[PDB]
Amino acid sequence: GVPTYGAIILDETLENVLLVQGYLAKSGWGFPKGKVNKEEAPHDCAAREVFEETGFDIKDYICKDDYIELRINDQLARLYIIPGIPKDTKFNPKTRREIRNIEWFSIEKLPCHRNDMTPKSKLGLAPNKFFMAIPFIRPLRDWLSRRFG
Ligand SMILES: CCn1cnc(C(=O)NCc2ccc(F)cc2)c1
């Protein structure tokens, strides 16, 4: 697949992250992000995807080195970490045909792994509406420790 870029936006306490919920195949919650255009810089793709999905402009806050990148089934997803955005900020998508909802979620209440089905003697993972966000939660928790303490 083609690389995706986006943001992990945090509030002022650093307790909460901003997630978006899509429709149909993208019906769960995740960080706002999307596919790079041809010849587009990562930081510009991130700013654009976040603006389209949330109405918030991260251009003046992105730090070029502050991101978490994961290759997930051979698809790179890089999310720039944007701390300190006020929780009263009013978010409104441009592409409202693709975004159902936009909400803050507590980091400490988000899972950092999905639960198994071992009490059912069944292999695999139970469905989780935070599936897309989950792989970033531990690395974010470790980046926040290392940056802020
Ligand atoms: C099981 C696969 N799946 C479920 N939900 C997603 C998902 O990415 N939701 C968040 C989102 C981000 C951006 C966007 F434009 C629309 C939705 C992926």
Cα of 149 to ligand 1 centre, how many Å? 31
Total number of domains constituting the chain: 1
Q: What is the domain extent for residue 7? A: 1-149
SS3 of residue 10 by DSSP: strand
DSSP per residue, 36-79: PPTT--HHHHHHHHHHHHHS---TTT--TT-EEEEESSS-EEEE
Q: From which experimental method does this structure derive?
A: X-ray
Cα of 99 to ligand 1 centre, how many Å? 9
Query: What per-residue string of b and e applies to 90-107 under the rule 16 or more CB within 10 Å gives b?
Result: ebebeeeeebeebebeeb
- The residue whose two tokens read 């806050």 is 61
CATH code of 15's domain: 3.90.79.10
CA distance 127 to 131: 8
In short, whether 28's Cβ falls inside 6 Å of ligand 1 is yes
